[PDB]
Each structure stands twice: as C-alpha cells, then as structure tokens.
C-alpha cells in the first residue's frame, strides 16, 4: 500500500518535496520509484531508488534538479524537485517494484504497486 502526499502549486525556478509513504514490512523488499504524467501525454519515468545499495535514477529531463532520498524510520521516500519548470506540471506517481536492477527500476511495465498520485503546478 503507497499513499503520496505534499503535492501543489508552485512558482517557475522553486523547489518542491512531495512523497511516498508504504505499508512498513515490505519497506526493505521493494524499490521506489516515482512517475509522471503532464497533461495529455504518456506517463514516464521520473526518478528510481533501489532496494539494493540506495543509488537513485533519473530521467534526463530532470538529472541534477530532481533527487531521491529514504527515511527507512517512516517508511517514506522523498522527491526533491529544485529549479521547477513549467514543463513539469503533472499528476507524480509512486510505486513499488521488486527488482534492485537500473535497468528494471527506469522501466514502467516492471512495477506491481502504485499510488494514487500528487498533482505538481508550476506557474
């Protein structure tokens, strides 16, 4: 079970946090990820932390301003976003997947778990 929260509207060039909390026994079992859909478009990959060593993942739309970081206590993954653009406005979804691999975790198809979404505005 993931449940999102610290979504809103927020200025060109701010910084925004929003995150991810999970059921807690399966906290060590499943790595996090995080994707997006802006309006009209596909969902995409946004951002990966693997269960296996915690590296994090990103995509090159949003390598270097977006990062990724857990709080194993809470049971809850963070996405920091510095330097917003208008283009990322979009519904920011977590979920959970099984595998530790960078090659499964920027992959959409590969996760078993979703959230229910955060809407992100950036004027």
């Known amino acids: 079970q993931l449940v999102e929260s610290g979504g809103g509207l927020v200025q060109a060039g701010g910084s925004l946090r929003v995150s991810c909390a999970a059921s807690?026994?399966?906290?060590?079992?499943?790595?996090m990820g995080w994707f997006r859909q802006a309006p009209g478009k596909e969902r995409e990959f946004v951002a990966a932390?693997?269960?296996?060593?915690?590296?994090?993942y990103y995509a090159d739309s949003v390598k270097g301003r977006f990062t990724i970081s857990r709080d194993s206590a809470k049971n809850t993954v963070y996405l920091q976003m510095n330097s917003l653009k208008p283009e990322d406005t979009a519904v920011y979804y977590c979920?959970?997947?099984?595998?530790?691999?960078?090659?499964?975790?920027?992959?959409?198809?590969?996760?078993?778990?979703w959230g229910q979404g955060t809407q992100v505005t950036v004027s």
């Open positions: 932390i693997s269960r296996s060593d915690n590296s994090t």
């Open positions: 807690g026994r399966t906290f060590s079992s499943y790595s």
């Open positions: 979920a959970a997947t099984p595998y530790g691999s960078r090659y499964y975790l920027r992959e959409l198809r590969e996760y078993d778990y």
